[model samples]
Each structure stands twice: as C-alpha cells, then as structure tokens.
Target chain A: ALVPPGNDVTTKPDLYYLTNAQAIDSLALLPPPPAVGSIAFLNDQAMYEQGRLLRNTERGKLAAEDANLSAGGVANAFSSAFGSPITEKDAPQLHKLLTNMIGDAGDLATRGAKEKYMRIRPFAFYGVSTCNTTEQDKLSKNGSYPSGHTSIGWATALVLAEINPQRQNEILKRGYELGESRVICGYHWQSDVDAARIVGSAVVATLHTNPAFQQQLQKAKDEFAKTQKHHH
Target chain B: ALVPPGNDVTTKPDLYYLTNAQAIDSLALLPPPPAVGSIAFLNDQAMYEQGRLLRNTERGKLAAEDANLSAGGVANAFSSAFGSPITEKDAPQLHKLLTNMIGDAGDLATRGAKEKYMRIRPFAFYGVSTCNTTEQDKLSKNGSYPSGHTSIGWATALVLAEINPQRQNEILKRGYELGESRVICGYHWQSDVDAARIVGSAVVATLHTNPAFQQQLQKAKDEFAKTQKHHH
Candidate 1:
C-alpha cells in the first residue's frame, strides 16, 4: 500500500486548518482549469510527451518511488532535502503532526477544485502507460487539475522549509521537483502541477493564520531542531 | 512609455519589496523553462497558434488594449472588473500607490528568471504580428520565460482584491485573465503566464511581510473605502 501502514495516526479535525467548502468558495481565486479541446490542452499533451521521455531516467525512478504514499516512501523522498531522517523513532511528535496534517491539508485545498474541473489524467486520455499502474483504476476515476500529490508534496516542503530555513533552497527545490515528478510520472500535466503549487502556497498561508496550527508548527520546528542537535 | 505616466508617484525603495537578485537566488523554486525542441515547446507553439486565431475576437481587442502600460491602460483594463473606476481623480492616494508599486514589484520578481530562460516571444519567433507592435523592438530584446505584464497584473489584482474583499471574485478573475490576455496577444507562452502567477503570489506574500508596504497597504485600503462611501 502506498499509504502509511498503520491506523494509529489519528487526524485531529480541529487541526485541519482549511476545509473543502472554504476552498470551493475561493476557486475563483485560481485560474479556471483549461477547457477540454482548448489550446491549453495542447500544452498538457506536450508535457505528457516530455514525461514519457523521462520514464526511464533516474528521475523517473525517483518519481515512481514518490508515487506511493507509504510512511517510508514519503520519508525517503524528503530525507536528504530535509537534512534529517523523518521517522517516528527519531521525532514522534513531528512525525505524527506531518502524518496527520498532510492528507487533510492538501485534500482540503485541492479536492473542491479537482471536482470542479474534473480534468482527465494524461495517461488515461492518451491510453498510455505510467509508473503508477497499480493505482490506475482508482486514478482513472479521479480528476487531475490541482494535483493532490503535488499539493501535499509542496505543502510538506513548505512546512519543512520553515522548520529549517538553513536548508530552505534544497527543501523548496525538492518540494518543487516533487510536483515535477508527477509530470515525469505522467500522472499530471504541467499546468496541474503549477496550479497545485499556488494551492499549496495559499493553504500554507491560511494555516499560518490559524493559532492552533501556529502552535503545532512551532512544536514541530522545535522537535526538528532538537532532533538535528542530538544527531550532531 | 510602457509604464503609466505620472509625476507625483514615487516608488519607496523599502516598499519596492523583492529585489532581482533575491528572485534570481530563488529561481530554483520555479520550474526551469521548457527546453528548445522539447515537447513542452510544442505546447507553447500551439498556444501561439491559438493566439493568432483570436486576433479578431472582442476578447482579443481587450487583450490589445492591455498590451501597454500607458497612463490609463492598466487601470482601464481592471476598473470594470473591480466594479469601480481606478484613477488619479477618483482615488489619488490609492492610484499613486498602485502606479508606484506595479512596475517595480513585477519587474523585481520576474527580470532574473526572464533573463535566465531567454525565451523568444511567439511573434518574433514566427515573424508574425502582435498587438504590441509598437514595443516590438523592446519585446524582442526581453526574455519571455516569465511574463512581466502578467506578473504586474496579478500583483495589482492581489493588492486591489485585499482592499475590497467584497469584489474579490471579480478582482481575482480579472487578474487571472490579464495574464491570459498576454497569451492572446501573442506576447507570451502559456507557461510564461503560469510561472508569473506563482511569482506574483510569492512576491505579494513577501510584500505583506514588509512593515512599510503594510502601512501603505492600509492607506490604500482606507482611501478606496472612503471613495466608495462618498459615491454611495
């Protein structure tokens, strides 16, 4: 399974900083998804080709690894960029906070826009193969605009970057590349990734405005700083 | 001149916000421009074709009107969408603030990325005509990885929308459209416009962090509110 293996990680609904309803109300805040058969779709198709070309590269392999949502998978993708291994064994509180927040935060910001646009994924539209064949059936039914994975990736990057500004460049670079990974995996168009970035930034901005989230953010930061110090 | 004409307006250096060097340093935060002869460029070409096809539509004419930064050009394009006219006469303080901030803020966020990417505009590439003919020489010399006009448009919209949240939907929609206008005018590729929106959002986010900008922002908001009250 791509998701974390255990059910012990409980989502704190109150910790859910943004809601799908709020996202829907602000859908106008985002550019409307490209219309079917529009010129914009041509761009999407071109990016798909680019992704297909990269399917055999090292980057493509990394993209495949990142395609899954397992705890190990997520940690592996960001560990180097974060400059520390993110694990329950090392920093339980920070791990729990990230595990709990990632899905809710990203889904809250993107689900509404996804449903509104209902964009078909590049693989499905072209009847092409992707690195995510295991999830094809479920993904086929899903919309592609404002990519959920990309949103989560960027959101996680934003939080982690804040936790360690010294590695901000590496963190943000990896965060951005995470979205590009989706493009390389042929699961998203370039625009899908682009739109997700905006959503991530907006959602993170909203999170900072919430006092509870701010407190948790501080806790995570402190936990991370301590973990790094102990390791050194 | 592409910039709005005015004498009283003064760009506060501290309020000038993001710098070109700072933006360049963070350029890695954005996706690299499409490579030459790549599939992504195919999409850019298609969008250019789409722009050519729209040379006669009403939206195309509006796009042409937005091709410059003449005295009232920027304001006229956004005034109706804002549900009020923005001008020196109607709201002098707000007008001065916007006119001063738009160009510097946008250029600061985009210039480095543009130079790095050095993309050729559609018109120059195809040896075709565009709405921005008067500035063809300058346009040819400028890099196109990020659309400067689109950056300014979104930044302005972000500022104005904050000032009048009641019309936020309209304000944001117009802001997003302003970028698309550049695409329709054959002056920018779709990706250029897309990247610029991120830069705009990021730059505006950065702007809010500055105390000087915050002070000016409040003044602008108050000025707009008083003008609306007087009109009613």
Candidate 2:
C-alpha cells in the first residue's frame, strides 16, 4: 500500500495529545512575562553545565566511535538493501533511483527544502525516549518535516517493487515501516512520516516523465534479475 | 546548615545519582543518531571535543581581589557562582543556595549526575581543572559534584544528621569534604566524599505531599538558639 498522507500531518489530535493541554492550561497557570530574566538565567546555567560535562569525559574517543558507528549504519543499510557492497557494486540503479525521484534539479532543491523546514524530531520532546542519542550530528542537514529516509526509501522501494510486482506489498510495507521506525526510535514525529510519504509520492510522479530514467529502470531490472539467477 | 528541599529534591541522591548516571553513561555511552545528517554528527563531535581539558597559566586570577573587588565576598561568590552580579539582595535563598550549589537545573542534572555516577571530577577527568575559570560566579556550575556548595553535598550533610542522630559523626565530615573543596578546587568526585548519604532518602515521597517545607527552620533555630541550641 502507498504511504498515506494523514498519518504524518500535524493533526489536531497530535498537537492536543502532545502538549498535555498546556496551551489551554496557560489560563490557569499565569505564564511568565515573555521578556523575563529566565532566558539569561537558563542560558547561563546551560553553558556552565555544558562546559563541565564536556570537561569531564574522553570526548574525542567517544565522538570518533559515534561518528563511525552512525556513518557505518547508514552505509550498511544502503548497501544491504539496494545492491552489492560499496566495494564491488557499481550502483547505477541507485543513482538512477535518486535522479528519477528528485529529477535533474540536483541536490540543491532538496537541500534548500531541508533548511526551509527545520523540524525537530519527536525524541527531542518525548516523555521517556530511548533513542539514546549523543550530541547532535553535524552532517544530517535535512529538516525533519519531510523525512529524507522516507523519500529515498519509497523511491527505492517503488523501483524495486515495479520490477517484481508480486512483492509490491511487502517491499512498500518494509519501506514505509523504515520511515515509521524513525518515530519508534524516537527520531521523528508522526507528521514527518506523513510528509515523507507525500514527498515520496511526488518524487515517484516526477520520475515518470524522464525517458532516460524509464530506459535505465528496465535495464537495471534485467541486470538485477540476472544477478539474482546467478546467485541462486 | 540545612539543604532546601527544592534544591534537595532536584539534586537529591537517588534522582541526582540516577540522572548523573543517565547523563554520563546514558547520554555519553548511548547517544542518539544524527537526525538531520552531518550537521547532527558535527555538533556531537564538537560537543565531545569540547570535553577535553585545557591549561591556563594565569590561574592565580581565581584569588585576585582586584578582578572585581567592589562586590563583597558574598557578591563575589554570587557573581562568581553565577554569571552576573545581582544589583539587590533580592535573590531567593533557595536560588542563592542553588546558585552556590550549581547552575541551571538541566546542567545541574547532567553535570551533577555525571559527578555522582562517573565518580570523576573536573581535575581528575581533565587532569587539571584549574581555577582559571575566568568567568566569576559562572565557574562553580560546570564541574565538581558533591560539595556543600552542591545540593548533594549540603543535603548529605544536612539530611543524614536529620535522619539518624548516630551517623552525624561521619556524615558531616564527609559531606563538607565532598561539597566545598572538590569542585571548588577541582579535586574529588561529586560522590567520592559523601553523595549518597544526602539525597538517598525520601525525596520522591516528600514531593506529592503538602507538608511544612522547613523554610523558616534556619532562621527559627538561629533565633531560638540564643539561650538553647539545636542538635543533630
């Protein structure tokens, strides 16, 4: 099934449930003045505490391992799901998938859109999250409203599913679940998941216009089938 | 001297210990994945790298009266303990004690927890947490865990004596030892001297109840003790 739209939209229910009626409760609990000294107080404390936390750990080692593990996980997921390992595979199929999905507009539009929507992940606001996140990574540039994983996951799954329609439901399910996993893992909100499905659908629609992309899709499918046969 | 329950609650032993454990081991050991991309990754790296120790040759400035001498010792401690000097003695006793104890609640929770759980102080973790903390009032918030200055230290000393009349012998010695000098000079674990003794009892139990908070206990005792003295 195609990823639905309402699932990721910031619905009335979502906002109401998350805020714990704080917006409504503002009447009873006279909120402080907007320009109170709390900011200075809060920031001063934050900086001081941050300084201490930083000073008392082997940050270099921790950071290095963290960077490697995060980068490695992305690499591994990409490699295992799509094609051969990074070393042996010439991922023309992957390249085609990306291009067809986003069009020849290059990465700028996507990157620009990322900045436009500086969405916070769900884990940042949850009650008792288990994401076990370290410091924010510098490399992940996309805003959270429309998940990059969903966009790419759907794009990749569609291409793969089209080649083998019999497994269409399974592939799409897995692809969509991967996007939802971001929420379950406490990284994204449900709205992000919804928006990503829209983006994925839009990207797929755009891909239909490219003749070269169509030709590449058929060729890659043939090659993949052959590769699978050889493996068997 | 008694530790205020507000500060004591936030910096209480079980909460402080658990939070400290979570901050160092949980946050440090199991960090979140970079949500957006490299941006998240880089931020984490910067945070981790920020943890390293630095040297300061101008360390003698910590004791220099000339730095900002117009402020009385109380002012100096307030300003040094906090970022800016207070124009009036309008600071809540609780806030002042907290200011003297640590800084912002989040940082207090994180750094305070780190000291207790990690059992490492700024000097030990960094091999030299010099008093070159150039920012007066702001210096105390960053490192040093269990000290009279910190809630855990004060609480340990204050509470243990309150709870059991017998343990007063060892708790007071250990309480001030951990609280005052550890982070003040950057020498001991927040927990090493006597962290658990302070907040280990009844913090959460006391939260939901509306009991007399003992705010006036200090002033009442001081006045009443002219002819009669209070005991542990």
Candidate 3:
C-alpha cells in the first residue's frame, strides 16, 4: 500500500539505464516487461542467471588451481618477458582497468543470465560445500550452472593478451588460473566453470563487433605500450 | 597527488551517495578557506558532531544491557511484542520499502554528518571496551560516530510504530534494542547510540512535514490494519 501507484506501469530508471551506452546494445536481446507478470518473470530469470554466472566463474578459478596456476606468478612472468620496469603511473591504470573490466563483465553476465534463463543454483540442493569439490564449492549459497568469475577472468585475459600480444599465452594462462581461484574459493562446479569460459569467449567475440569498443581498445593498447616504454 | 582534479568538489554521485551527502552540505557551511585557516575546521566540526552521536548511542546500548540481561531473552521479548508477520506476498513490498528506507536514511546521515562532523571514533582513542563483559568488545574502526545503525533503526521503528500506534511502546523498545545491538556488535560506544537515536527522532519528525511521505504512511497503515488487528 505504501508503494507508489503506477510505479509498475510507469517507465522506470531501467528504461534509461538499459538505453544508456554502457548496457543498451549488449542487453538488446531482453524484452522489457510490459506488465507485473513479466516483471516477476524477469526478476526470477535474473536470479537464476546470477547463480549460473557465479557458478561458471567458480569453475574457471578452480580449474586454474587444479593446474597449480597463480595470478601473481603469471603477472610477474608477463613483466619479466616484456623486460620493462613497472612504474607507479602504470600501476593505477592497469589495476583499475582489470578490476573495472572484471566487475563490469560480472555484472553484465549476472544480469543477462538472470533475464535469459532462471536456473536454480546447485547449493539449493547439495548444500554449499558438498556439490562443487572445486573452488566454486564455497559459493554454493548463491547457485550453480554458470560461472561469472570464469567469464570475467577469460574476458579480461583475452583483452589483456590482445593489449600485450607478446605475453598472450602467459595472460591466457593467468586468466585460466584466476578462474581456478574461484573453485578454490568454493564458488562453482566444474561444468559451470567451463561454461563460463565459453560465455566469456562469446562475450569477447560479440564485443569485437562493437566498433566503438574496438576503438577504445585500440586507444588503450597504444597508451599501455607507451606507458611501458617510459617511467618517472 | 593521485586524486583527480575535481575530487575536492563533490560530483553528483558523491553528493547523492550516503557517505558524501553531509560532506557536501558541510562544505557549504564553511567560510571560504584562509578566512578560518585550513578547511580542516569544516571537517573538525563534522567529526565532533559525529563523535557525540556515536558515543551517546553506545552508552545507551550499554546501559540497556544490564549484567543479568540475556541476548536471547531480549530478542525473543522484542520479537513477541513488535514483530510484524511477513508473508510471501507482503515480503517483496515490505522488504523493498524497509531496505530503501534504511539505505536512504543511512546514506543521508552518514554523508551529511561526515561532512559537518568528520570526527574519529572513540575506539580509535579509548581502545577500551565499555561492555567488556559482553562477547562483542572490540576496537571500532572508521566511521565510528553518528551511529548509522541506530539512526536508521530508530527512524524506521518510529515510522513502524506510528503506523500502528497501539504498539508504539513495543516498537520503540525494539528500536532502542536494535540500536543496542550495535554496541553488542562492538561497533559503537553508548554515547554514539544515544546521539543516533536523537538524530533519528529529529529526522522522523521532519518527515512528518513531508506530505508525500505522510500520504504513503497512511496508505501503509491502512493496508497493514486490513490484514490484522491493531491491538498489541
């Protein structure tokens, strides 16, 4: 009763948020809920998708752990191979971009899956620690099916490797390793992690079609190369 | 040095955020720099106010926790008296409203008080626990003053109690008890809790003048009464 009347029917922040440059095109596949039922459907679907993405990411991290991979190691290896000293200015932007990319991708995947298919999480049945023996197991409380971390990890890895193609294998290995961390963190099951990698690859593939995003990537790549060669 | 150029001037998001809201407001109150020495004076005032509020609330909570009092008993008694039954249908609306109200109030008080007060918490200085006998005795960290939990609890409780006047005392008791939980949680001192309650009361009072809020309150009250008796 306290709820604002017509809020359900009224155009909401979503209309603006969804139409915004950040999410508009990627989320175009989603149909805006016209009525209360559709809204409920969307909400349920969102929850399911969140679980799936979360699971997938968990698996990717676990897979890396199984292979005895370490993100720090990979990063150090990349630096050594480039033969360039890391600087303070380099520190902020690199970390910032990587962090932001992971976060953004995680968000997009969660929302997308939630809207696409409302699958129940594994934790709903097997309890949190039991089902996913890998790193994804800990995140059982949320759900299973897809892995968000894997998607983000792979996506970020792909982007970073493209930026420093010379360290492509190392970057990819690092991404795969980080995905395993989620498994060690008990976040996802194995299948979910593998699926997340697939999703991540798909997302990256789709992103290539975006001319604007591609342009930004090129600019970032150039700036990174310049930064690597110079320091304070 | 790393801070962006305009960080000194609050952006719209910073102003809108719960933590930064008060800071922006406090900036307005300060006399231009040099006239009153450094801008730290603005921060100092905000900090002092925040400290006072935190200390008061902390004290109140400690006072409520008599040596003989049991957490279980207190929680049960409060639940019996003022606990609103949450059914599946009522869950969404009630949850959303409660969450929105708490988040909005918390954000406003934190940001507003921080800007004007900017005070450090007592734990930072005292390093001593007033409720040493309780399980939750620890040195609190950042944002120690102003009692976010208490402020929001009291504000929400007052609104809830007002909706059903018969349970006014019960609701108030529970609200105060909830405020006490912060101390039990070892997050604030007694003084902090008391001040937050005062602030919350003031805010609730001001909300009375908002016609839109009043209208909404009325609707909630009517709807709530329709489902159950108003008797305590």
The number of clashing residue pairs in each candidate reads 2, 40, 72
RMSD of 3: 25.5
Say which prediction, candidate 1 or candidate 3, comes out ahead on DockQ: 1
lDDT of each: 0.66, 0.38, 0.43
Sorting all predicted structures by DockQ, with the top scorer first, yields 1, 2, 3
Q: Give the TM-score (0 to 1) of chain B in model 1.
A: 0.85
Q: Of the pair 2 and 3, which is ahead by DockQ?
A: 2
Candidate closer to the true structure by lDDT (higher is better), 1 or 2: 1
Docking class of 1: incorrect
Instruction: Please name the candidate that would achieve the greatest lDDT relative to the true structure.
Output: 1
Ranking of predictions according to TM-score: 1, 3, 2
Model 3 chain B weakest 10-residue run by lDDT: B1-10
Model 3 lDDT per residue over B1-232, tens place:
0111222113433112122212212122111221123223333333334434544465544444422233212222333445565332553333333444453344443444434454454445445444333327443355554666676666666566545544544555566666555554345544455446534543443344334445555566566666565543
Better of 2 and 3 by lDDT: 3
Which window of ten consecutive residues has the lowest lDDT sum in model 1 chain A? A1-10
TM-score of each: 0.72, 0.30, 0.32
Which stretches of model 1 miss by more than 4 angstroms? A1-12, A19-21, A24-46, A52-56, A70-105, A123-140, A155-168, A201-232, B1-15, B19-21, B24-27, B70-105, B132-140, B159-166, B208-211, B214-232
Q: What RMSD, rounded to one decimal, does every model reach?
A: 7.0, 20.3, 25.5
- Indicate which candidate wins on DockQ: 1
lDDT of 1 by residue, A55-100 (tens): 7889888787676554224534777888877777776666655665
Give the better candidate number (1 or 2) by DockQ.
1
lDDT of 1 by residue, B1-232 (tens): 0112212114335235433333323255567777767656776777777876786898878778777555235644678877777877777666666665564446666665766678787777777667756544555644887887777777777677667655655776787788887888888888888888766655565555445666777787788878788889
